[PDB]
């Protein structure tokens, strides 16, 4: 369904944010 | 549907937050 | 609908957060 | 509706987070 | 309703995040 | 309900983020 | 259901963000 697909798109965007947050942690360690 | 469209708008905003978080990571590397 | 309108209001708030995160990146570059 | 009202409450909390993120940017500029 | 109550629980968690973000700003100022 | 339960799981994950943000605040104060 | 499943996927992504935020705190302590 379109609603479930859009919710999965939200989850995908949140995973992109998680990736970026890990990059922030790595930048701080470096 | 309007609800699914709005959920996709939320996903797009979250992708722009991911953009900004990558920008923070780059600023910390520099 | 009121639900779709409220979801769009959430999207707008998330864009507001993205803008604020970009301000953080700008402060870190400076 | 109660669901729309709760969604608007979520949007309000997200705007509160945006304010705090701008406060972080201001602290970094200082 | 249980759905509205769960959405209000989400907003409550977001306000705790806002609190923490304000304390991050306070820490950076000091 | 399964939808309400999943929303409560989202709230719980947001509380975990709030926990982490408090840890960031305490790290900056230390 | 597909909607509840997608909401649980959102919660999973939020937990990934929480993990990353904890790693930011650890990097700041380090």
Numbering used by the authors:
A (entry chain D), B (entry chain C), C (entry chain A), D (entry chain F), E (entry chain G), F (entry chain B), ...: 2 to 31
Paper text:
αHBs are oligomers of 5 or more α-helical peptides that assemble into coiled-coil structures with central solvent-accessible channels. We targeted two properties of αHBs: oligomeric state, which directly affects the internal diameter of the channel; and the identities of channel-facing residues, which fine tune this dimension and introduce different chemistries. The αHBs are loaded with an environment sensitive dye (in this case, 1,6-diphenyl-1,3,5-hexatriene, DPH) that binds within the channels and fluoresces. Accordingly, challenging the array with analytes leads to differential displacement of the dye across the array to give a fluorescent fingerprint.
Despite the requirements for aliphatic residues at a and d, up to 40% of these can be changed to other side chains without compromising barrel integrity. We introduced mutations at one or two of these sites to generate four groups of αHB: Group I had entirely hydrophobic interiors, but with different sizes and shapes of channel; Groups II and III had polar uncharged or polar charged residues, respectively, at specific points along the channel; and Group IV had aromatic residues installed in their channels. The twelve Group III peptides had positively and negatively charged side chains, Lys and Glu, incorporated either singly or paired at a and d sites; and a single peptide with Asp at d. Finally, one third of the designs were crystallized and yielded 12 X-ray crystal structures, all of which were open αHBs with fully accessible channels. Focusing on the small molecules, the αSA signal from the more-polar AAs and CHOs is dominated by the polar and charged Group II and III αHBs.
